[PDB]
Amino acid sequence: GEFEKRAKELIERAKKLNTRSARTAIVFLANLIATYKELKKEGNEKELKLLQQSLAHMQALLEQEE
Amino acid sequence: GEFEKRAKELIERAKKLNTRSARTAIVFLANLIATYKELKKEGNEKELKLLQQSLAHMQALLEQEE
Numbered sequence: 001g002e003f004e005k006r007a008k009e010l011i012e013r014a015k016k017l018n019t020r021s022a023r024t025a026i027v028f029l030a031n032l033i034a035t036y037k038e039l040k041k042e043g044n045e046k047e048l049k050l051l052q053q054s055l056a057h058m059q060a061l062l063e064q065e066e
Numbered sequence: 067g068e069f070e071k072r073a074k075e076l077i078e079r080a081k082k083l084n085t086r087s088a089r090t091a092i093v094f095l096a097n098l099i100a101t102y103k104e105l106k107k108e109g110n111e112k113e114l115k116l117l118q119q120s121l122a123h124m125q126a127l128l129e130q131e132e
């Protein structure tokens with residue numbers, strides 16, 4: 001999975017805070033996975049990098065939270 | 067609006083990318099507005115700050131694209 005696996009690890013990790021904000025991050029990260037799978041089929045590497053960056057920003061918001 | 071108008075500023079710039087990844091940022095930006103308005107009515111202010119931070123990461127992710 002690579003991108004998906006780190007996002008799902010963030011989905012799990014965030015799922016244990018059970019708040020409103022976090023249920024907004026979970027929905028978003030789920031959408032990043034779905035968008036990532038399509039952009040990989042499309043071969044759009046600039047946007048794949050863009051989403052990888054978004055994944056590393058969400059990790060630094062949900063690392064400080066927990 | 068404080069949070070909302072800047073989120074709308076990020077929505078505006080994301081729409082001028084006309085990319086698949088930007089429609090995920092816009093969708094997510096609308097969800098942040100709705101979630102922000104919600105807990106703002108509760109006075110749950112620790113989470114409003116967290117959403118403010120997520121908006122400022124979104125602001126620094128969309129800045130490379132243009």
Ligand code: NA
Binds near residue numbers: 027028093094095097
């Ligand atoms: Na979203």
